[PDB]
Design a protein around this ligand. Structure first.
Ligand SMILES: CNc1ccc(-c2ccccc2C(=O)Nc2cnn(C)c2)cn1
Lengths: 156, 39
């Protein structure tokens, strides 16, 4: 299949028409998405097959073809950009100062941008263009909007 | 069967739309990977 780095739509024909179920990141020959997008299923790229390599339902991450490659971190200070790929709409960058998820196991960056569920997996970038994590795992807030962690995996 | 389509390069863009707040939220993460609000 297509193995060029960049951001990809994840699609199914299992419903009416072609439906976008989420998004992911191709880096160093590895496809990166959220677990709730694919539920760990194999993916087609052209007539190529992408088989799952690593996943963790609790982290809500999954890699295809190789080990998680993405190792950059929110600095805790600087704005970031969601590279939102919404269903049927062009890739669009959205710049935002993340808030914080406070957890018993530590603080996580969080982004307060409301997009359809099929945007799940769009990358969050720093100022140098590095993927600091993925959008689409978080919480519906007092206001009814969705606030997403910045979800990052570990690189071995 | 799910398939992938390329949607763009991964690039920082100068003069992107700037929106969204920065809420500090108390949350818990369950074994199913669902976050929840802790008040
Ligand atoms: C009507 N309720 C909701 C709830 C979540 C979302 C949403 C918004 C942005 C990005 C992802 C999601 C989302 O669905 N995330 C998710 C994580 N795990 N699962 C199983 C689903 C939208 N509307």
């Amino acid at each position: 299949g297509e193995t060029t780095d960049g951001v990809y739509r994840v699609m199914t024909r299992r419903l009416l028409g072609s439906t976008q179920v989420g998004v992911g990141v191709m880096q160093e020959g590895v496809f990166h998405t959220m677990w709730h997008v694919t539920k760990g299923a194999a993916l087609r790229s052209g007539e190529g097959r992408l088989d799952p390599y690593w996943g963790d339902v609790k982290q809500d991450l999954v890699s295809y073809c190789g080990p998680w490659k993405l190792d950059a971190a929110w600095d805790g200070l600087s704005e970031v950009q969601l590279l939102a790929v919404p269903p049927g709409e062009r890739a669009k960058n959205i710049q935002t100062l993340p808030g914080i998820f406070k957890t018993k196991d530590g603080d996580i960056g969080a982004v307060a941008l409301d997009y359809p569920a099929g945007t799940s997996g769009s990358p969050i970038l720093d100022k140098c263009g590095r993927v600091i994590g993925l959008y689409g795992n978080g919480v519906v807030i007092k206001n009814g909007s969705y606030v997403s962690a910045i979800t990052q995996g570990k690189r071995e | 069967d799910m398939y992938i389509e390329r949607a763009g390069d991964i690039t920082w863009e100068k003069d992107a739309e700037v929106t969204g707040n920065s809420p500090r939220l108390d949350v818990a993460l369950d074994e199913s990977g669902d976050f929840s609000l802790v008040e």
